[PDB]
């Protein structure tokens, strides 16, 4: 549909701290005249540039697995 | 940078799109901007550039000082090359940091 601009800024973000594992909850952005073909997770300890994880556009929940204790 | 008001960093990154550089250093402001108190070094001789001991492991006596070490700093790769620094990364009391004011104030720059 538009692909004349960059996707906007998402709308909301949750996550949920485990032993090993963090579920992270997400919702797209309020305007829907950008087209979206996805969400890219990026995780690590003390930056978030550590790994990247791309998933599709229907996806709103995903839960980041094998991670450290403390 | 200036923010114009005291925020609790958790990380200052660096994206290069020339090689990253041999020796670099952060600096941070606990007033807005009149004294600089240094953050981390990055070197391959923190001795001869930045007068700090190179791979200094955290000690608990002291977790308000600048470490160097020559991480990072590899000229490889030439193009995208990445320095992110963890202010809390090796500092011994960071598992209890909501009960530690010394890095409460470690974190703490304008």
Same mark, same amino acid.
């Given at each position: ?46 930056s978030?540039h ?21 | 940078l ?9 990380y200052v990154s660096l994206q290069f799109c020339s090689?990253r550089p041999?020796?670099m250093?952060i ?13 981390q070094?990055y ?13 200094? +492991? ?8 600048? $470490?160097?070490? !020559?991480?990072h *700093? ?6 995208g090359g990445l320095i992110a620094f ?5 500092? +011994? ?8 004011? $010394?890095?409460? !104030?470690?974190? *703490?720059?304008?």
């Open positions: 549909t538009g692909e004349t601009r960059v996707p906007e800024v998402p709308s909301s973000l949750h996550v949920r701290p485990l032993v090993t594992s963090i579920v992270v909850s997400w919702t797209p952005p309020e305007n829907q005249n950008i087209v979206v073909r996805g969400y890219a997770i990026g995780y690590g300890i003390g978030p550590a790994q990247t994880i791309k998933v599709d556009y229907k996806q709103r929940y995903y839960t980041i697995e094998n991670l450290d204790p403390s | 200036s923010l114009g008001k005291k925020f609790e960093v958790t090689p041999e020796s250093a600096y941070k402001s606990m007033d807005y901007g009149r004294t600089w108190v240094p953050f070094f070197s391959t001789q923190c001795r001869k550039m930045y007068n700090r001991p190179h791979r200094a +492991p955290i000690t608990k006596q002291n977790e308000q000082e600048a $470490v160097c070490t !020559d991480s *700093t590899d000229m490889r790769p030439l193009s963890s202010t809390l990364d090796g500092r +011994p009391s960071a598992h209890d940091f909501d009960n530690s004011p $010394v890095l409460q !104030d470690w974190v *703490t720059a304008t």
